[PDB]
Design a protein around this ligand. Structure first.
Ligand SMILES: CC1(C)SCN(C(=O)[C@@H](O)[C@H](Cc2ccccc2)NC(=O)[C@H](CS(C)(=O)=O)NC(=O)COc2cccc3cnccc23)[C@@H]1C(=O)N[C@H]1c2ccccc2C[C@H]1O
Lengths: 99, 99
């Protein structure tokens, strides 16, 4: 699809068999999702945003569908205000910016 | 242009007669620039994201040049770690997400 930016670029995602809304976010290096249960071991990560830094749990090789496109990659879990799909998965789905 | 997302989508902008590097950020509602002088009236605003909120100064009707494209809109100024071009100006340059 082509997504204009007059509104927030929110899409449906599927992760752990559940549907969530997430924001396609070219300003985010990584993908960060609100508290949920994911399989496997996690490792620590600190991520920094507009307000400062938060601690998150890093899960690798997680299956996620983004607006109907399958990705498999790193997903961070923690106190984000919004589920965000960052460049690590945007690249997997072939997402580009165009003007 | 078509901008891939293998790396941070950084561009050169001209604002207040100054050249700055800034991030094309589809997850940002607004445009926020590191401390600088801008002409005209301003009002305080709180902006939030990962790690919480910061206080900024809101300037309206500011002209910016982004990759050769002129646009006008609100620009926020304050302690952002990165200059961010948000949706209020990305729309004006005809920037879309495509996959
Ligand atoms: C969807 C959100 C709410 S959460 C993430 N987000 C966004 O707009 C995101 O694209 C931000 C943009 C940003 C880049 C760099 C520094 C700070 C912030 N990016 C992020 O939150 C991500 C988190 S990560 C590492 O993937 O897990 N950080 C990054 O990619 C890289 O951050 C950094 C890079 C370099 C130096 C840094 C120093 N100190 C902190 C962060 C740094 C939205 C938001 O904050 N929006 C607010 C915003 C932002 C700018 C202007 C106005 C407003 C209002 C809100 O719309």
């Amino acid at each position: 699809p082509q997504i204009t930016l007059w509104k927030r670029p929110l899409v449906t995602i599927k992760i752990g068999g559940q549907l969530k809304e997430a924001l396609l976010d070219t300003g985010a290096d990584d993908t960060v999702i609100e508290e949920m249960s994911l399989p496997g071991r996690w490792k620590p990560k600190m991520i920094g945003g507009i307000g400062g830094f938060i601690k998150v749990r890093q899960y690798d090789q997680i299956i996620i569908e983004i607006c109907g496109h399958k990705a498999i990659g790193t997903v961070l879990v923690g106190p984000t205000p919004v589920n965000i799909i960052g460049r690590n998965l945007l690249t997997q789905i072939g997402c580009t910016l165009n003007f």
